[PDB]
Amino acid sequence: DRGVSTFSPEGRLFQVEYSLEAIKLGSTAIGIATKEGVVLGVEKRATSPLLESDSIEKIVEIDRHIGCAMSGLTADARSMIEHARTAAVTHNLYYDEDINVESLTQSVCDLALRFGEGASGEERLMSRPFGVALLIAGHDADDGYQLFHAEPSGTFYRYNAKAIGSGSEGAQAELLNEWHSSLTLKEAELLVLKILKQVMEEKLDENNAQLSCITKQDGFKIYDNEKTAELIKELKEKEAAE
Amino acid sequence: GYDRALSIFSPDGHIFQVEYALEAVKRGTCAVGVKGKNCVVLGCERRSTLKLQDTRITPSKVSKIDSHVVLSFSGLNADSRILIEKARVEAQSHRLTLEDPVTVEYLTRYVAGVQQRYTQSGGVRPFGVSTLIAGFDPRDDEPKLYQTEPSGIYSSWSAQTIGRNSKTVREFLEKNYDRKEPPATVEECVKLTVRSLLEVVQTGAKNIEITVVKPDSDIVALSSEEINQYVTQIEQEKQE
Amino acid sequence: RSTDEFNGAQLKAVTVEAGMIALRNGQSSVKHEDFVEGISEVQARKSKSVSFYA
Amino acid sequence: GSRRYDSRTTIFSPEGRLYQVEYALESISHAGTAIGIMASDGIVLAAERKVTSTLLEQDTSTEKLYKLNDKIAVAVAGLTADAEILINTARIHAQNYLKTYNEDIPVEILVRRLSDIKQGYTQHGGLRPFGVSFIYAGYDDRYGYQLYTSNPSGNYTGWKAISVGANTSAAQTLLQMDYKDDMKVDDAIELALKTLSKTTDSSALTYDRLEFATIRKGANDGEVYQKIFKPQEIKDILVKTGIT
Amino acid sequence: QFNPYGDNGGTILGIAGEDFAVLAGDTRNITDYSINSRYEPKVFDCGDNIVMSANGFAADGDALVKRFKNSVKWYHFDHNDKKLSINSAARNIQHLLYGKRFFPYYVHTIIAGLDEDGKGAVYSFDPVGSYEREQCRAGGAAASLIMPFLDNQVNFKNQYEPGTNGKVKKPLKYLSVEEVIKLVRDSFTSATERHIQVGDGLEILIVTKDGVRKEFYELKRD
Amino acid sequence: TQQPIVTGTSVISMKYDNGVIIAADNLGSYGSLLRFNGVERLIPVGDNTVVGISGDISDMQHIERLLKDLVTENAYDNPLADAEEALEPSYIFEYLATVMYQRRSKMNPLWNAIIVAGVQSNGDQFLRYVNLLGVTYSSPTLATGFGAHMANPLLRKVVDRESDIPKTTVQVAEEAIVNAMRVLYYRDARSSRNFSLAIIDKNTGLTFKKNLQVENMKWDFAKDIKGYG
Amino acid sequence: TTTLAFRFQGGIIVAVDSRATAGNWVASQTVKKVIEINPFLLGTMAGGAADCQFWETWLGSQCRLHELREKERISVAAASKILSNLVYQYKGAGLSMGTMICGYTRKEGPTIYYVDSDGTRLKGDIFCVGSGQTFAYGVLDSNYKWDLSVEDALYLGKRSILAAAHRDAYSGGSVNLYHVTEDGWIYHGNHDVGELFWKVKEEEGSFNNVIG
Amino acid sequence: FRNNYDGDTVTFSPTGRLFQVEYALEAIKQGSVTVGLRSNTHAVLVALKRNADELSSYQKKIIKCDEHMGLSLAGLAPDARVLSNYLRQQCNYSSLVFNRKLAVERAGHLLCDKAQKNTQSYGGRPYGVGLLIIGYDKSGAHLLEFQPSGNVTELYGTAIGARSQGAKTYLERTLDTFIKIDGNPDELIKAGVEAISQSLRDESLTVDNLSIAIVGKDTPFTIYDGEAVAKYI
Amino acid sequence: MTDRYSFSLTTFSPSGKLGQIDYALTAVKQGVTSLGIKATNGVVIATEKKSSSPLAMSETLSKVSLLTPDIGAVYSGMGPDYRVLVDKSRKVAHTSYKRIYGEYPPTKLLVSEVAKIMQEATQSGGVRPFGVSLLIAGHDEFNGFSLYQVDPSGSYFPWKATAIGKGSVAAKTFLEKRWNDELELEDAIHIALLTLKESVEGEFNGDTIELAIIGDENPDLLGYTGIPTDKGPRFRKLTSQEINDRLEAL
């Protein structure tokens, strides 16, 4: 067998190459972060009118001032999110302090890393690093507002703007030009929805888009239905000039 | 015992096991849930064809997990038995430690975490088992109908079909129920569940179980004479 | 010194690759620089690129 | 050496049906026939031995019908070695429950736990699973007589008649035509012995190739009495029915 | 049967200024009637302007001081090279001490350092491991001689504002580092005279934003 | 909890300008029974340290195995031995101390009192104390057990403080130790005239004088006493 | 040591002391005996301060995990049972524990559970803890009325402490007051028991046998 | 190619080579280039910080172990995280008990033993990462080269990552130059600037991408970037 | 360091029935001949025991071993597998047996314990089955003399007569006729030796032929005759002279 132990000819881990394709199938998630708020907007998958769109979630609270988006294998990513939650509470106990987004990002990668092959310095009970990527966002003083993109590689990069999932490639191409330092919260919100309709297979609705923010004022706060609708409605009026 | 990797990702980014698990679900005989705003109505096919099988002591798919939380399935009949016991201990563990019976929402996550552990471990094959979980949340009468996948994902659904031939059954629910307003009464809702099941069952009144669970831990089973009563109405629609 | 565990055949490929590169640049004469680049093209692994996993 | 080589029986099959379990049913049907016929007033349980060797003292050695306790008897078909371990495990389980609660274990509970052990083996045990089917003929007051059978799968199913071992279909078909819901234990004794002879290639199925047991509540003063019938008692009732 | 824990006396005096904090302790080390050492500092700055003394049994304190220093390195790792808060340092010591409650460490541990507004802070630890913020709390063996003196004249506690006797007390006043050295010295001098354990020398660590300032005052050596 | 049997008592010491002077009785008393005689327990390691050991002799052997073991472990890997990975009195002191504290936490401490004395490579004088309790201090003059109550003050005269460490010459310190054993013989019942005097010097290295004996004793006053009441 | 909490029509009144004795000397005359487990729930500190700080901080840890997972405010009933099981298992350690876990939900009304190091879970409406639990019990029960204003309920609690405070030796310091609404505790401020004692003495003419 | 033996760690080819190590040498060349040089009194690391794209911020490649010691990662990035946490603990322990700082030679040796162990038996990947360990101690300045195999070697300069040959050409010419420079930070750093421009072909430096650190007699471990490194250029 | 196996090497053949059980059995058949006749007043067990090399001591080679002083046993198949299985069986019986009873195990009981152990070998990954068949011949109150045959499959049944090894087919048939319901101890031995000659001809010295009976009780052999109501060893291992004697009375 092709273990974690045994590498590809190049020297890459097998699981890292495979996990790229796994994420690709996943749900599109778009992140634009600014110093006026992190805006996370995600595509909600829907197969029936009969599915109830309230119950499902793809933005998941990990902590009072920490929001996350997930893509990849969802069921593995459901555990990933449970343990991330544990880590945060455990730090809060030790220092009486809200974890830096950046440290939290590292603490999660340390926990995906641990296999099944059988070490001699470490505890084994998995088989692989999770083949899921996450966008870990949040607010703290030192760095201001942050957005991180964690890879299955065991590598974290901070981003201004990052798109993962199906629409990874086409959303990123626009986000390079359109993202700026000048942008504020109301600016950012409209842009995300605009990119989202092009990469959405069907129509854009407020009932298959879910927006949230991390602001330091509110912490993690999921937007109600009404705000979401209104920014869609506002975007329509401008599109019909053309 | 076993602990070696079987969670080896394809180069098509999927666990092989999880795929096979999906294949298994289908084969298990259909189960249907459509919730009203005043009930949850559960239908399922059971084996009773065989002359010289006594149904009283042949196990019933529909399972008490709590007085107000019930569970049905499609999938491996061996693995469900294990599943049901796990839920029963958890259900009681909540009354022991946090007090009050499981909130339904909490048991759905418990059931899902078992499947997830099987994918975290390379040793343990996921069960090839999907379940319908239905009940009334504590201190409340709100009907919940939940659905699972054997891969460890859960979601709430207004109506559901799992098991054999979901195609014909799905197409019927898209025309016969609409989400804007649920069936008004228990009687209107029983009729739709019944109508849907008979599509892929073909008649019977003796073989099929319909179990209505209403609020405040009322579980009551339909007599064969009551089942037929709904069939008698529907025969007239089909004629006109 | 650069080349380690390469046969006669492999070395030969390193020099042939250099001329394609010199031609592409459009130099009259091949540079030492081009041979180095042929070494990591004859290599199985992909040529030097920015980080992205490692 | 050990890394390279594999004999994993813990692959999740692509057909939804584990291949090893498939072959264990084949192996069951090589072993002789055991028949459970549930009547209102008892379970008539009868199994033919598969040896027929003359030097072999079959008389003494019961090898298929083992009395666990007063209300519960098991007939074995399948691998006799694998079977021995499960007999001791099933005996200790009924005793432990009887000690804790002061009630003979309901039939349902006992059968379920034993099935779950078989299941466990292929769940993540790494073990080859036991290639045995057991008919657990049991009684308890609440539910009357109860009849369940197990599978190498770790699945049990209740019945009013079941067959395991050889000639599953031949036996099952006769019992369906001849047994009626209301026939009592008394009839079932006569019925069982005759259908077995007719399935088997033997001209007369001798008393010495038979094992016979009944579990009945028609034992006076509201009591339950089992009796593994001794080979010569099988012989007298063999003569009446005209097999001999 | 070994004694559960020994003792090594001493006395320390914690005072919070309002931009600085001063932790002073006798340099003597004493057990029974023998002076174990003349000069062996007890207050050590352990880092990020937090000074620490675990007065009482010195042996217990060597273990505690080290484990706390190991966490100072790691506070940078966990918080992405950020300043170790006095509050955060307090919680970390607390855990160890709860862990060594079942074999119970005898300490009165006072940490002093800087809070968020840049102010003086004095947090003091009971031997089991509870801690509370306090304006001034003395520690050690002669904690009880020293502490009311500081309470009365700093806080003006029951020092009536004249005319409004019984009601209003004298208005609270600013602390300055110079005024504070003069108080500390006086308190050590009284303790020297009535308590055998205090004397010989005093090693005062003044803690300011820009570092630690070490200054040494003689005390009677008889 | 170890029950102490055969005991060493008294290891006396004082610092001077260039190094340390360390001296001990040699005798393994077993209460009143002087079962063992001539027990050397000033134990050298390199030129730069002599480890004077007091307290239980049974434990003393166990402690010696650690010291033996520490010389081999430093020697491994590296060739260095000029002074770079050479031991220091600090390194040896701390190594013992950590270990001792582990045993005393389990309520089974190792029952000894250890003075480590020596000279650093830069040349600074090193004199610290560790004991069963793991009370750690550097002090200018030291004496353990019975020695503490007379030798501490005795040695303290000549060097009373840290700024007398430069003042005191090797000549004053040598004189002070000769007297000190004469006293210790007279008024301690576990102290023979037998002594080993080690000069740990940075300049000349180890000059180790074994088996110095004070051979001349005071009893003049005894003859005058004849009364009783 | 005098701490109490008692239910009334408008909520719960929690009134506590702050004097902590090490030895016989008051080592700290002010001490927070109000632990915010979370922003809606308050525990009283009693017995060993270290046992209580660690164990009510730890409860808070589970509280955070419950708020994320269930997305529903943490029941009063739940949080008390999790402490009671934990303290029981570890009972006979030396852990010195005595806490009334107080919270006010709209799903159970205002509620109090007394929990002990024993692992007792007692529902109640009057609970009081400490050496002066006998004096405070006397006054309180006799002027207890469920149907009562917020203002009268507060001032009863001030008086209750004060009566008990003089006579109990180790109770003194200052009084921390809270009135617990539905949406969590709201602080009703600190009042020095010394200063409080002047005001009552004059107004009501109480403590007229005491010569102040 | 696969072939040979590499799913099985124990088994080797006729020659004696284990394929696993070959892959791990390649892995270095794919990731970050970093160069080191040392004089008798200072030890220098010059690391080129890199990213995936423009909006990405740059990411440290020197990870500070201690005030007296450091390492820089170039092959597998999850592997490096492991070893650094591990090495942080070993310096603490050695400082605590022996009162003596973990000298650079032993530190490479403890490290070899850990990697070797995973490759000795089934279970456990080879650590594929190539680390360049600096450290300043009583016996002056050291630079070691941690092979994926578990071999440490003392060098005066070294270069790792693809097209490392260019850098080595320069360093050998100025071997003598570099060593006899002593007490000078400026001088050293300036040479190392040039060493890495030899490596880089059809590739650009940027001053913020260039990250340089020293540790020495008078200097603890310090990282300089931006305006700071503009001085040494 | 444990083998990285984590699973049963033993698989069901795709036609049913374990590969390995079949594999183990062949050894018993290939190995040299043993026969036994159960009798009413004893049990005769007999085996060929050919010189390995004339220079080899042919007395120290044994195939009869003791399980209890009442019950002895002989095997066919792998020699080294037997030795270990005997040692395990002494412990499994004796200690545990004494704790729950404090006697010697009856024969029925002893035979069943052995059956489980054989099964557990096979089931257990990293451990391949014991391929030996033992005949355990013994005495108990409640069943008179008994002979059980224990197969390497972990299954046992009692037999009037049985044989294993090469000559089993020939032997069983010869015996079948000669066996009677009432049997003399003397005749059981004559008949046994007569058949054994046909297994491999020649070498009928009683040295190279190993013969034991589970004869009648002796307080003589017991080594205390002070109370002679105590059961003596039922098992007797015959001398070479005794065998020599039997050849003349055949």
Curated annotation (Swiss-Prot), chain A:
For this entry, list what GO says about its biological process: proteasomal ubiquitin-independent protein catabolic process; proteasome-mediated ubiquitin-dependent protein catabolic process
Residue list for modification Phosphoserine? S48
Q: Report the main location listed first in the record.
A: cytoplasm
Q: What else is known?
A: Present with 17100 molecules/cell in log phase SD medium.
| PROSITE patterns, sorted | PROTEASOME_ALPHA_1 (PS00388), PROTEASOME_ALPHA_2 (PS51475)
Q: Which SUPFAM superfamilies match?
A: N-terminal nucleophile aminohydrolases (Ntn hydrolases) (SSF56235)
Which Gene Ontology cellular component terms are annotated? nucleus; proteasome complex; proteasome core complex, alpha-subunit complex; proteasome storage granule
Q: Does the keyword Phosphoprotein apply?
A: yes
Question: What InterPro entries does the entry give?
Answer: Ntn_hydrolases_N, Proteasome_alpha, Proteasome_alpha-type, Proteasome_alpha_type_5, Proteasome_asu_N, Proteasome_sua/b
Where in the sequence is Phosphothreonine found? Answer: T47
Q: Which UniProt keywords apply?
A: Cytoplasm, Nucleus, Phosphoprotein, Proteasome
Subunit structure, briefly? The 26S proteasome consists of a 20S proteasome core and two 19S regulatory subunits. The 20S proteasome core is composed of 28 subunits that are arranged in four stacked rings, resulting in a barrel-shaped structure. The two end rings are each formed by seven alpha subunits, and the two central rings are each formed by seven beta subunits. The catalytic chamber with the active sites is on the inside of the barrel.
Compartments it resides in: Cytoplasm; Nucleus
Q: What is stated as this protein's family in its record? A: Belongs to the peptidase T1A family.
Q: Which Pfam families match?
A: Proteasome (PF00227), Proteasome_A_N (PF10584)
Designated name of the protein: Proteasome subunit alpha type-5
Curated annotation (Swiss-Prot), chain B:
Q: Which SMART domains match?
A: Proteasome_A_N
**Which GO cellular component terms, listed alphabetically, does the Swiss-Prot or TrEMBL entry include?**
mitochondrion; nuclear outer membrane-endoplasmic reticulum membrane network; nucleus; proteasome complex; proteasome core complex, alpha-subunit complex; proteasome storage granule
The record's Pfam families line, in alphabetical order, gives: Proteasome (PF00227), Proteasome_A_N (PF10584)
Keyword field: Cytoplasm, Nucleus, Phosphoprotein, Proteasome
Q: Superkingdom of this entry's organism?
A: Eukaryota
Q: Does the keyword Zinc-finger apply?
A: no
Name the Gene3D superfamilies on file: Glutamine Phosphoribosylpyrophosphate, subunit 1, domain 1
Cited InterPro entries: Ntn_hydrolases_N (IPR029055), Proteasome_alpha (IPR050115), Proteasome_alpha-type (IPR023332), Proteasome_asu_N (IPR000426), Proteasome_bsu_CS (IPR016050), Proteasome_sua/b (IPR001353)
Compartment list: Cytoplasm; Nucleus
The record, for SUPFAM superfamilies, names: N-terminal nucleophile aminohydrolases (Ntn hydrolases) (SSF56235)
What's any GO biological process attached to this entry?
A: proteasome-mediated ubiquitin-dependent protein catabolic process
**Phosphothreonine modification, residue list:** T58
* Family the entry assigns: Belongs to the peptidase T1A family.
* Assembly: The 26S proteasome consists of a 20S proteasome core and two 19S regulatory subunits. The 20S proteasome core is composed of 28 subunits that are arranged in four stacked rings, resulting in a barrel-shaped structure. The two end rings are each formed by seven alpha subunits, and the two central rings are each formed by seven beta subunits. The catalytic chamber with the active sites is on the inside of the barrel. Interacts with CIC1.
Q: What PANTHER family does UniProt report for this protein, alphabetically?
A: PROTEASOME SUBUNIT ALPHA/BETA
Q: Which NCBIfam families match?
A: PRK03996.1
Name it: Proteasome subunit alpha type-4
Gene name linked to the record: PRE6
Swiss-Prot record, chain F:
Q: Does the keyword Nucleus apply?
A: yes
Pfam families, from UniProt? Proteasome (PF00227)
Which BP terms from GO are recorded?
Answer: proteasomal ubiquitin-independent protein catabolic process; proteasome assembly; proteasome-mediated ubiquitin-dependent protein catabolic process
GO cellular component assignments: cytosol; nucleus; proteasome complex; proteasome core complex, beta-subunit complex; proteasome storage granule
Q: Where is the signal peptide?
A: none
Q: Provide the primary localization.
A: cytoplasm
UniProt-annotated location(s): Cytoplasm; Nucleus
Mind listing the UniProt keywords for this protein, alphabetically?
Cytoplasm, Nucleus, Proteasome
InterPro entries, per database record: Ntn_hydrolases_N, Proteasome_beta4, Proteasome_bsu_CS, Proteasome_sua/b, Proteasome_suB-type
Which family is it part of?
Answer: Belongs to the peptidase T1B family.
**PANTHER family given in the database record:** METALLOPROTEASE TLDD, PROTEASOME SUBUNIT BETA
Q: What does this protein do?
A: Non-catalytic component of the proteasome which degrades poly-ubiquitinated proteins in the cytoplasm and in the nucleus. It is essential for the regulated turnover of proteins and for the removal of misfolded proteins. The proteasome is a multicatalytic proteinase complex that is characterized by its ability to cleave peptides with Arg, Phe, Tyr, Leu, and Glu adjacent to the leaving group at neutral or slightly basic pH. It has an ATP-dependent proteolytic activity. PRE3 and PRE4 are necessary for the peptidyl-glutamyl-peptide-hydrolyzing activity.
Miscellaneous notes:
Present with 16900 molecules/cell in log phase SD medium.
Name assigned to this protein: Proteasome subunit beta type-7
Q: Which organism is it from?
A: Saccharomyces cerevisiae (strain ATCC 204508 / S288c) (Baker's yeast)
Swiss-Prot record, chain H:
As stated in the Swiss-Prot or TrEMBL entry, residues carrying the post-translational modification Phosphoserine are S13
What compartments host this protein? Answer: Cytoplasm; Nucleus
Placement of covalent cross-link Glycyl lysine isopeptide (Lys-Gly) (interchain with G-Cter in ubiquitin): K190
What superkingdom does the record give?
A: Eukaryota
Which regions form coiled coils? none
Q: What's one GO-annotated cellular component?
A: nucleus
Q: In this UniProt entry, which cysteines form S-S bonds?
A: none
Q: Which UniProt keywords apply?
A: Cytoplasm, Isopeptide bond, Nucleus, Phosphoprotein, Proteasome, Ubl conjugation
Q: Name one GO biological process term.
A: proteasome-mediated ubiquitin-dependent protein catabolic process
Role? The proteasome degrades poly-ubiquitinated proteins in the cytoplasm and in the nucleus. It is essential for the regulated turnover of proteins and for the removal of misfolded proteins. The proteasome is a multicatalytic proteinase complex that is characterized by its ability to cleave peptides with Arg, Phe, Tyr, Leu, and Glu adjacent to the leaving group at neutral or slightly basic pH. It has an ATP-dependent proteolytic activity.
Task: Fetch the PANTHER family from UniProt.
Answer: PROTEASOME SUBUNIT ALPHA/BETA
Q: What else is known?
A: Present with 7210 molecules/cell in log phase SD medium.
Q: Which family does it belong to?
A: Belongs to the peptidase T1A family.
Subunit composition?
The 26S proteasome consists of a 20S proteasome core and two 19S regulatory subunits. The 20S proteasome core is composed of 28 subunits that are arranged in four stacked rings, resulting in a barrel-shaped structure. The two end rings are each formed by seven alpha subunits, and the two central rings are each formed by seven beta subunits. The catalytic chamber with the active sites is on the inside of the barrel.
**Which protein is depicted?**
Proteasome subunit alpha type-6
Q: Which gene encodes it?
A: PRE5
